[PDB]
């Protein structure tokens, strides 16, 4: 229960649609209400999974 | 070693490799000749087990300027054993050597690996005839660019005169001032004047009747 | 009484006939298409490299100066100024998207060049003016100033000896002889519409005067006037009719003004509302208060019936040049234009060809000239014969204009 | 100069399909077992060679210190901006999505030679500085319409249309393969082609066979594809459509079902009708309007032709009108022959039984007959197909078209 309470006390994530990927772990995402962005990936996700 | 390969051309017996390679058992710069008489006896067939040892031994290794000639000459012998299974491996040859070398290569690709297209066919078709100016209009001048301008030269190693004048004259226009005329002003017009050699007499392509060789190979392969 | 399936009878089918090579040929095709995939993700060589210079020149900048241009450098914004007050700054400044502040000048400014309506560099924290700016120029009229010559000479607009004569009077002659209009006491018209059948030569007369203009010429893309936002298209009209007043005697060519407004109605309470606001803004900067002076407007359409009578009034569009079909002397001149630069027999006549194209346009005549050479490549020739053109007339016109009158013709001979 | 900008520095990306379209035994023979295993040999070796390529790389320098600090010089959340004007003192002005405009500098390694007001750039968050410039900027609605795969077989697939096959080859394939004939007469090849006729005749096949055997790239447009609701979103996608085709290869564009894109351009009372009618009026402008076209060919296809706008039918825009009529008693044999290629055919049948007796039916009818007769063999527990399958199949397919037209007035 204490492990359940600490993980919920954490800022939420953003949802954004990937247009298409760049090279070397970079993509091209407009979120909803903003410009587009070139960001970095995490460990568990890959370029070929996009 | 080339006259050795011409004196033992065209037999897949693999005794000639046992003859030649055990005869010049030597240092590796003389074992440059290992790949010559190996595959000069291997003009054309399906012997894909040779084509993998034509890759897997000296594939890349990154090779800091020691046996870079041998991986070019190992790729030189990939050029034949491809020009007569009658187009079955020619599509596979242009698929591999377009992606693997000129894409993820180094000295093997960006210096020498275009002489396949100067050895595979001399007929001309816009697949490979347009894939070479993808790496020629991009001259990539940082190297000793007459490597890429050698690939300019026998890009016009396709006979049977064509509409390819659009490529050569327009590259000759950028080739007068830039791509300096001290070195290759002979070359671009050597490429220009060779397609219209005569009107006729363009059969230099080692295929008679339907598919037999008629060598032929002994006179071209020195160049 | 027809049923022929039961799970035991399924096993009859896939063992009868080539049990040797059925799966033996199939999974070879299956795993190679799997191998088409597994090469592609193993390559992964997409490489969208952009932005970077050649890496042999920026080495001096990105040693310390780039780190020196992070923290001391400023992320200041540009704004606009309403006014000022005496003895103090008391500067009133808007953004038009953010709020409106009342701020102070900084130390690095001269307090004279803080005139009203000026773009100024504004701090992010205390919002002080730092750097004044040159004024904004409109970005899309620069995109449509042509700065380029399309190569059509007046010798290619044959069959129109009088329509060019009307069009020469309005455009070319006051720009080169602005004397005889005043020295007799007349004024030239300032708006010319072009209307008629399609493919008749509307674009040619506009393309040929862009050659011989010696003046400012502005092509206007018609559907840039229609936008997504409300009132945005009307603002695009204004910036066009301001910079024309700055320089002297600039030409503005609209094209297909059928699209940007043809009729003003409201019965279903709605519809093309935003299109009307842009279209009526075009009218009030065409006539009204502040007449424009030396701005000449050319328009061209294919459907002139469906246009607004507010544009049909002279004073906005003054000369109605129409294009018709060339009778015979026009067409015989057109064949000599479009077939002089092609390998033909040097003895053929063209007046026989101009007979057989009774109701035809300049586009249809050129299509006959291109098609006749295509018959020469159907055979193996390098020059055109008389029967090459005669088959081309039947291919272009007679294959689509008539099918009952040619076989069952015997009412007319 | 003479060769200003050397024409946009841009290559072309054609298709990667058609690896080996030579499976020509077309039956369960050992050749096709031998041929496909050869294809298995080369692709496995292409896999293993590039597997050795990412394996035996002992080269590490990782930027030689130059790009590595640069990749740390730029921010990790790289953002996207838009130029408004260029103040060239290494301190320019940009615009964000909301319109917040910032007097940003140029943090370096960007040549000031390919940045124009309208070209989108790359920015920071902490200082908003220009780091790179965004390239290719395609809205992801036109990249969906870019074909990568050759779908079906070549011209030998369709069952005999050779008078009109030679027509479309004169305007698409032959000017691209051999443009030496045209300079001898100075005649430009035709641009626009209409495919029209009754439905079920071969319009969609003739585009797919061209898209199979080609060298330039290919674009497909399904009818009401360029239609949106934001009153300017319609005509804006058409500009980007021809922009992508012009920037890439000397390629062709196939826009199908253009009967929903043109009808005679009349003026009426509906307000949503006009943003329909306006988008379809500037396609006219991009096609054969102002100065130039480039090497872009357009192929269009409908069922009905008389309900079109006459502004599109005129030459200059479309130079070929091609009828596809219903077949004859001769080339119909080729339709039945091809669609009965790889099916076990009993020797009792005569192909000319159903051809000569009935003289009305499309090519798409014949494919339905061949599939239905094959279902009748499994319906009565058979592999081979006899005449009695085709007797029941020729009935069951054709009972979807009404009884007749008038009684024996004429004689
Ligand atoms: N009078 C003419 N003389 C010579 N050529 C002509 C003439 N009229 C038309 N043409 C030829 O027809 C082609 C098409 O004409 P154009 O498109 O300019 O007609 P248009 O009236 O502008 O068409 P639209 O009304 O659809 O804009 C031109 O390229 C031109 O070569
Ligand atoms: N001449 C032909 N030879 C072989 N097959 C044909 C022929 N004509 C039609 N077909 C068959 O018709 C199908 C293709 O349909 P088709 O190309 O006629 O559609 P379409 O003309 O676009 O129809 P619609 O106009 O109704 O959309 C294919 O499956 C093919 O088997
Ligand atoms: Mg026009
Ligand atoms: Mg269709």
């Amino acid at each position: 229960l204490r492990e359940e309470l600490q993980l919920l006390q954490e800022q939420g994530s953003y949802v954004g649609e990937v247009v298409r990927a760049m090279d070397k772990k970079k993509v091209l995402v407009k979120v909803h209400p903003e410009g587009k962005f070139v960001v970095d990936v995490d460990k568990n996700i890959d370029i070929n999974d996009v | 070693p080339l006259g050795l390969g011409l004196n033992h051309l065209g037999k897949g017996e693999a005794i000639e490799a046992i003859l030649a390679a055990l005869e010049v058992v030597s240092e590796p710069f003389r074992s440059f000749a290992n790949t010559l008489v190996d595959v000069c006896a291997y003009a054309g067939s399906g012997n894909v087990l040779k084509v993998q040892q034509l890759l897997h031994i000296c594939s890349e290794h990154f090779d800091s300027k020691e046996k870079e000639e041998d991986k070019d000459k190992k790729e030189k012998k990939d050029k034949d054993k491809k020009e007569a299974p009658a187009d079955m491996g020619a599509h596979q040859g242009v698929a591999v050597l377009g992606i693997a070398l000129i894409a993820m290569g180094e000295e093997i690709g960006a210096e020498m690996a275009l002489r396949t297209f100067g050895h595979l066919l001399r007929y001309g078709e816009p697949t490979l005839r347009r894939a070479v100016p993808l790496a020629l209009a991009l001259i990539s001048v940082s190297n000793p660019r007459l490597n890429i301008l050698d690939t300019l030269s026998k890009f016009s190693h396709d006979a049977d005169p064509e509409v390819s004048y659009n490529s050569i004259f327009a590259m000759g226009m950028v080739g007068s001032g830039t791509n300096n005329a001290r070195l290759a002003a002979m070359l671009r017009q050597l490429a220009q004047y060779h397609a219209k050699d005569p009107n006729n007499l363009f059969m230099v392509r080692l295929a008679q009747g339907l598919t037999h060789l008629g060598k032929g190979t002994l006179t071209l392969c020195p160049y | 009484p027809i049923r022929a399936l039961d799970e035991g009878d399924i096993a009859l089918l896939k063992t009868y006939g080539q049990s040797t090579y059925s799966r033996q040929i199939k999974q070879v095709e299956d795993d190679i298409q799997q191998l088409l995939k597994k090469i592609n993700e193993l390559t992964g060589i997409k490489e969208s490299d952009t932005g970077l210079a050649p890496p042999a020149l920026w080495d001096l900048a990105a040693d310390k100066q780039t780190l020196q241009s992070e923290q001391p450098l400023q992320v200041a914004r540009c704004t606009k100024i309403i006014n000022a007050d005496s003895e103090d700054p008391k500067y009133i400044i808007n953004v038009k998207q953010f709020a409106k502040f009342v701020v102070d000048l900084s130390d690095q400014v001269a307090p004279t060049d803080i005139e009203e309506g000026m773009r100024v560099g504004v701090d992010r924290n205390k919002y002080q003016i730092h750097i004044p700016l040159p004024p904004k120029i409109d970005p899309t009229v620069t995109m449509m100033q042509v700065e380029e010559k399309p190569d059509v000479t007046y010798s290619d607009v044959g069959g129109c000896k009088e329509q060019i004569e009307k069009l020469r009077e309005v455009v070319e002659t006051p720009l080169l002889h602005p004397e005889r209009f005043v020295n007799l006491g007349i004024e030239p018209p300032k708006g010319v519409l072009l209307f008629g059948p399609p493919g008749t030569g509307k674009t040619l007369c506009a393309r040929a005067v862009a050659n011989r203009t010696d003046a400012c010429f502005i092509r206007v893309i018609g559907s840039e006037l229609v936008q997504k936002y409300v009132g945005e298209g009307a603002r695009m009209v204004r910036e066009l009719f301001e910079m024309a007043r700055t320089k002297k005697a600039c030409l503005i060519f609209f094209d297909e003004i059928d699209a940007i407004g043809g009729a003003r109605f409201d019965d279903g309470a709605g519809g093309d509302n935003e299109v009307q606001r842009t279209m009526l803004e075009l009218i009030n900067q065409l006539d009204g208060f502040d007449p424009r002076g030396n701005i000449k407007v050319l328009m061209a359409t294919n459907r002139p019936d469906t246009l607004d009578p507010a544009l049909m009034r002279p004073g906005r569009l003054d000369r109605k040049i129409e294009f018709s079909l060339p009778d015979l002397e026009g067409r015989t001149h057109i064949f000599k234009i479009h077939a002089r630069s092609m390998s033909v027999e040097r003895d053929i006549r063209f007046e026989l060809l101009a007979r057989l194209c009774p109701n035809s346009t300049g586009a249809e005549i050129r299509s006959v000239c291109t098609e006749a050479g295509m018959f020469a490549i159907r055979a193996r020739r390098k020059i055109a014969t008389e029967k090459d053109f005669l088959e081309a007339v039947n291919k272009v016109i007679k294959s689509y204009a008539k099918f009952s009158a040619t076989p069952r013709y015997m009412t007319y001979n | 100069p003479t060769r200003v900008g050397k024409k946009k520095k841009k290559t072309k990306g054609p298709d990667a399909a058609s690896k080996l379209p030579l499976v020509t035994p077309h039956t369960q023979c050992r050749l096709k077992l031998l041929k496909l295993e050869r294809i298995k040999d080369y692709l496995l070796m292409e896999e293993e060679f590039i597997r050795n390529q990412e394996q035996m790389k002992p080269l590490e320098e990782k930027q030689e210190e130059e790009r590595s600090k640069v990749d740390d010089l730029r921010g990790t959340p790289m953002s996207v901006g838009t130029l408004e004007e260029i103040i060239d003192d290494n301190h320019a002005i940009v615009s964000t999505s909301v319109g917040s405009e910032h007097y940003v500098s140029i943090l370096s390694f960007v040549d000031k030679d390919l940045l124009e007001p309208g070209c989108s750039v790359l920015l920071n968050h902490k200082v908003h500085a220009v780091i790179g410039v965004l390239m290719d900027d395609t809205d992801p609605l036109v990249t969906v319409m870019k074909v990568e795969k050759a779908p079906q077989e070549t011209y030998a697939d369709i069952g005999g249309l050779d008078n009109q096959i030679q027509e479309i080859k004169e305007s698409v394939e032959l000017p691209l393969t051999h443009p030496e004939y045209y300079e001898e007469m100075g005649i430009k090849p035709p641009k626009g082609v209409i495919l029209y006729g009754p439905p079920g005749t071969g319009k969609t096949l003739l585009a797919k066979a061209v898209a199979n055997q080609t060298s330039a790239t290919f674009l497909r447009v399904v009818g009401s594809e360029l239609i949106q609701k934001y009153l300017g979103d319609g005509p804006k996608l058409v500009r980007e459509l021809f922009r992508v085709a012009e920037e890439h290869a000397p390629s062709i564009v196939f826009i199908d079902e253009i009967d929903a894109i043109g009808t005679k351009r009349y003026d009426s009372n509906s307000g949503g009708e006009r943003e329909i009618q306006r988008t379809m009026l500037e396609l006219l402008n991009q096609l054969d309007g102002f100065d130039s076209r480039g090497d872009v060919k357009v192929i269009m296809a409908t069922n009905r032709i008389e309900t079109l706008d006459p502004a599109l039918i005129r030459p200059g825009r479309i130079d070929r009108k091609i009828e596809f009529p219903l077949p004859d008693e001769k080339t119909k044999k080729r339709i039945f022959q091809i669609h009965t290629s790889r099916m076990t055919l009993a020797d009792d049948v005569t192909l000319d039984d159903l051809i000569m007796a009935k003289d009305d039916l499309s090519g798409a009818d014949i494919k339905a007959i061949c599939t239905e007769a094959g279902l009748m063999a499994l319906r009565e527990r058979r592999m081979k197909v006899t005449n009695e399958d085709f007797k029941k199949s020729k009935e069951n397919v054709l009972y979807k078209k009404q009884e007749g037209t008038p009684e024996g007035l004429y004689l």
Side-chain angles (χ1 to χ4, degrees), chain D residues 252-289:
Chain D
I252 73 104
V253 173
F254 178 68
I255 300 169
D256 198 359
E257 289 91 16
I258 59 98
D259 54 351
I261 209 164
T263 163
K264 75 185 173 68
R265 194 178 64 246
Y266 64 97
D267 185 75
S268 287
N269 204 6
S270 295
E273 184 183 1
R274 292 180 180 270
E275 57 186 357
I276 290 296
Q277 190 174 2
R278 187 178 296 112
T279 304
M280 301 166 180
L281 184 55
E282 57 90 25
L283 177 65
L284 195 286
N285 195 5
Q286 186 64 42
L287 206 281
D288 194 73

Side-chain angles (χ1 to χ4, degrees), chain C residues 4 9 31 53 76 267 378, chain D residues 40 98 103 109 167 269 278 381:
Chain C
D9 294 326
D31 62 359
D267 59 350
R378 291 170 182 264
Chain D
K40 182 178 257 73
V98 296
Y103 183 73
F109 55 81
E167 293 291 328
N269 204 6
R278 187 178 296 112
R381 296 288 187 87

